Design a protein around this ligand. Structure first.
Ligand SMILES: [Mg+2]
Ligand SMILES: [Mg+2]
Ligand SMILES: [Zn+2]
Length: 259
């Protein structure tokens, strides 16, 4: 989607003030002033990435949404420090030692939990599977949410609105892992299957990412992560021996042990 770049900024912010009691909170926008005193003593629980946007979660359930767009930039300084940048300050989240400042950005809003689901931008891009904060429990929730619970996995696993960081190659491996064909929906699964699928949606993408070697390394060394059905059409399933199939109207799957 954008690589570490997007997740990099979120991590910088977390490292600086995650879990630390806020000693001062300031917002430039008039409609945001009302949340200032309310946040004193609270802390950022985590920073979620959503496309090129950041969702700064607070322990009181409020969430600060920010999209740098063209000029926004977050800076971490020592509490008390006053940068000499001419950029306009929009947000200041201060803790005892570290302070993070958002300059120039215009897309800044405070959201309650129920507003996250209805936010235009957020509806278009879901959480990233490589985000350490994204947990299987959160995944099962999205799968069961009225918005997705009735979508076929074949298309859902290719839709960034559900989860970002997925691709066809990951989609087919994930479904093979839980023995499902692309026509199923989260609403028809039992608790066991749902949990199984929720873990696979994260484990497989992370396993593939963490172990990919350099370019052309495959010429002398096979990767730790091996595809089971992707590009293996015509080969036997390692589980049941059936011949892996590929569609033509690509979904790869074992018709022998996936249904
Ligand atoms: Mg080597
Ligand atoms: Mg079935
Ligand atoms: Zn099989």
């Amino acid at each position: 989607p954008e690589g570490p770049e997007i997740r990099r900024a979120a991590d910088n912010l977390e490292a600086a003030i995650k879990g630390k009691p806020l000693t001062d909170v300031w917002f430039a926008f008039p409609q945001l002033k009302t949340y200032q005193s309310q946040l004193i003593g609270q802390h950022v629980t985590h920073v979620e990435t959503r496309g090129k946007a950041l969702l700064t979660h607070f322990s009181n359930d409020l969430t600060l949404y920010s999209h740098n767009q063209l000029y926004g930039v977050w800076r971490v300084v020592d509490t008390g420090e006053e940068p000499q940048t001419t950029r306009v300050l929009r947000v200041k989240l201060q803790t005892a030692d570290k302070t993070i400042l958002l300059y120039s950005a215009s897309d800044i809003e405070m959201l309650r939990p129920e507003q996250l689901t209805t936010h235009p931008f957020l509806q278009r891009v879901g959480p990233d599977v490589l985000d350490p904060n994204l947990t299987p429990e959160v995944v099962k929730e999205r799968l069961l949410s009225p918005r997705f619970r009735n979508r076929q996995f074949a298309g859902l696993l290719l839709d960034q609105a559900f989860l970002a960081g997925l691709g066809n190659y990951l989609r087919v491996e994930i479904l093979w892992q839980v023995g499902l064909t692309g026509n199923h929906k989260a609403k028809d699964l039992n608790a066991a299957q749902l949990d199984a699928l929720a873990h696979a949606l994260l484990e497989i993408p992370r396993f593939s990412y963490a172990t990919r070697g350099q370019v052309d390394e495959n010429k002398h060394h096979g990767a730790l992560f091996r595809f089971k059905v992707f590009h293996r059409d015509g080969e036997p399933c390692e589980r049941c021996g059936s011949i892996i199939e590929k569609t033509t109207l690509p979904f790869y799957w074992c018709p022998g042990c996936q249904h």
